[PDB]
Design a protein around this ligand. Structure first.
Ligand code: HEM
Ligand code: HEM
Lengths: 161, 160
């Protein structure tokens, strides 16, 4: 008698490949920490700078934890899970409004950081594909029916050369 | 390296739109009264801040919202003739709506339904419609848990 709308999904959170330990091995802990540092400097120069701390202590605390996480996830020593514990990154991000644009700007900041620290080309794709896909899971505010944009490494490789 | 497999957050469940029985049972006047007191409830609720405050702007909201409800229950096409295609999730992107907001919005409708003495025969039909359709308006997630289902059977005693 009355119309029926089928069950639906908004969008799929794609599978994410975490980087192998080769990334830690080829890049080294110090480059990885420097990567995260200039990623944050780009963020404070981006349209989403307001989501981030201004007090140099809070910021240093953030960078350190992000760097610990990145180093560990790239195959390094368990700096993060031994200090902060379980990752549960989607849940930890609920307290910050993250829409599709926010993810795209965050990615852009990482892209530039990767080039500016001269991240070794041979492990660049493995790192990129991780953050590109993983970042989709942090999105907690939707503003469009369209799915979050996929940005494959092939689309951006020329930028690194 | 480790791979986390693809996943969904939650499913937008099936939604059953009301049959014309709801409009024939209630009549347009009651449906407009229902929407009016749903909005009086909203203005006293903890999501009041999401809504305009002047009589002029609320009258407008209420009129549009009621036009939609009347048409969707099987009455005249007041909404499509004026506002056009529903696209309701899309229209709500402009309001920040988390899980609690949907629950509060539903609670306001639950009380309105009772206070306007909505005809008991079509009460569940109307309820199951908004209970499910409202999940599709949520655009701000604050928990990994799925949005609460509130089936008519869990609240049917509230009405009598
Ligand atoms: C998608 C867009 C993203 C935005 C806009 C964003 C922004 C933020 C903000 C504002 C914080 C502040 C800390 C807090 O919430 O208390 C934070 C924390 C953090 N973010 Fe993100 N983030 C994004 C994605 C990611 C991704 C993909 C990762 C994966 C490596 C990540 C890793 C972290 C870590 C490790 C912390 C610190 C957690 C802790 O203190 O234990 N973020 N992020
Ligand atoms: C789930 C929680 C919901 C919240 C918090 C919410 C809140 C709002 C707000 C703030 C507005 C705009 C107010 C204004 O323009 O002055 C609006 C408009 C409207 N809402 Fe909702 N809403 C919700 C769910 C729903 C549902 C389930 C329906 C289904 C009938 C609905 C139907 C409408 C209609 C028809 C409009 C008018 C759109 C237009 O201007 O054409 N809403 N809502």
């Amino acid at each position: 008698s009355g119309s029926i709308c089928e069950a639906r999904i908004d969008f799929v959170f794609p599978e994410v490949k975490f980087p192998s330990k080769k990334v830690y091995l080829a890049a080294g802990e110090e480059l990885l920490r420097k990567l995260v540092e200039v990623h944050h400097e780009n963020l404070m120069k981006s349209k989403i700078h307001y989501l981030f701390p201004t007090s140099h202590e809070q910021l240093r605390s953030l960078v350190k934890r992000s760097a610990d996480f990145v180093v560990e996830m790239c195959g390094g020593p368990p700096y993060y899970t031994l200090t902060r514990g379980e990752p549960k990154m989607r849940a930890r991000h609920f307290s910050v409004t993250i829409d599709e644009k926010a993810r795209e700007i965050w990615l852009a900041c990482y892209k530039h950081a990767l080039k500016d620290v001269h991240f070794p080309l041979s492990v660049l794709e493995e790192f990129w594909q991780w953050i590109e896909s993983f970042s989709i899971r942090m999105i907690n505010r939707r503003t469009t029916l369209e799915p979050p944009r996929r940005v494959p490494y092939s689309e951006i490789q020329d930028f690194f050369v």
